[PDB]
């Protein structure tokens, strides 16, 4: 019958973000997405303001075809890692996300621009890290307060981090708020931050006709 993909332990989002153990959903194509009720988070604790909306785009798109891009980030330390997101115990992070931190107490104002002139739509998923204390904010991103402002030709979005102590998840009180931005052909995107940017490593390919759907079941076909 149909082409069903089982998330098993990785949910629709953790597969898009690339949390540890979720490599098996990379390159996967499906018509229906089996979101098991037994799924668990396995990386840094996060939250998606429109979790139901973002979860919808991933399920409806019908494919996890990630495409790489090189952002020449300025002087920030790239490939950050934390012990709540261990893969093979390597302190790790989302394999689709890039955590940027200051190098020698110098986090510079960034300004990168990525253009789509192709024949597919691009899905940029990025985040904003919310430090727990103003000392943790400074130890990671020198400047205070933080700033993230991702823009297109028709959409300007600006996120201001909320510093504070949240409930303990994997023994951690900080959080990362994940957002998304869709860049249609002819449009472009502009990352601009002075701190707290959970930068992306690329974009997913979007189908112009999205016929897939999601399910939350119990067994394989």
């Amino acid at each position, epitope marked *: 019958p149909l082409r069903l993909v089982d998330g098993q332990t990785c949910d629709i989002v953790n597969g898009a973000l690339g949390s540890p153990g979720c490599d098996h959903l990379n390159g996967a194509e499906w018509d229906i997405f089996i979101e098991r*009720p037994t*799924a*668990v*988070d*396995t990386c840094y604790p996060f*939250d*998606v303001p429109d*979790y*139901q909306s973002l979860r919808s785009i991933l399920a409806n798109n019908g494919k996890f075809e990630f495409i790489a891009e090189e952002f020449q980030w300025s002087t920030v330390t790239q490939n950050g890692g934390s*012990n709540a997101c261990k893969r093979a115990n390597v302190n790790d992070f989302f394999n689709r996300l890039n955590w940027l931190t200051k190098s020698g107490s110098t986090y510079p104002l960034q300004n990168l621009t990525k253009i789509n002139n192709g024949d597919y739509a691009r899905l940029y998923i990025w985040g904003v890290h919310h430090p727990s204390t103003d000392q943790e904010q400074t130890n990671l991103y020198k400047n205070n307060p933080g700033r993230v402002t991702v823009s297109t030709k028709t959409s300007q979005t600006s996120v201001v981090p*909320n510093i*504070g*102590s*949240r*409930p*303990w*998840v*994997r*023994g*951690l009180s900080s959080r990362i708020s994940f957002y998304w931005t869709i860049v249609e052909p002819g449009d472009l995107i502009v990352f601009n931050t002075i701190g707290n940017l959970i930068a992306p490593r690329g974009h997913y390919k979007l189908n112009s006709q999205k016929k897939s759907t999601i399910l939350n079941t119990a067994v394989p076909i």
Partner: antibody
Amino acid sequence: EVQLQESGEGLVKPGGSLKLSCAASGFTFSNYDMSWVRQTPEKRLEWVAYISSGGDYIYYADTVKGRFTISRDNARNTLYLQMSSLKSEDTAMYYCTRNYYYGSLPVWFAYWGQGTLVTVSG
Amino acid sequence: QAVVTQESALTTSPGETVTLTCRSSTGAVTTSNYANWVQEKPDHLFTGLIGGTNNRAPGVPARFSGSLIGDKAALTITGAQTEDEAIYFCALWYSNHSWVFGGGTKLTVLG
């Protein structure tokens, strides 16, 4: 399904020490966070301990900090609570706790154990 | 400070709609406080009802719903049955401290 049962009920005298245990089953114990919550005879609820899925991050309340020491043995699926320097006012039913994070935000203290009674007064 | 107060007891009848509240003494109740609702069935049977202010736990019937009423938290039972007769506890996470539990509301279905 998911199932927790406490054990170790007993009488201790003030100032002594008592160790509580929680036998976990129905889930991979090493991937989830655990806490201890108690209920005084006045039917009030009070949180007393927290431990990460790997035991790296442990936190207590001011009421028992320095006195209580929480631990877990992920290979046996057993949650422990080492109580010491006990006072009268620690008398409560001690519950095993755990949460459930799935639909967007999580639910703290979803799934409770049967609770085992500890009487501080000697 | 950091004292959570909720109703001492509430009474209702089958089929009616009831709302349980949970007020914070430190000020207003915010999404950031992460209101949690627990139900105590007799003989020390506890079951988590609502987490993250509004997210409904897996086994919870759909008639339960949690939301924010003004500066309080609120648990709404829409179409109460006699098996809703239990004590309902609240939990607010205060950054400073941690989870602090209210006095709990004892609900009685008159039947």
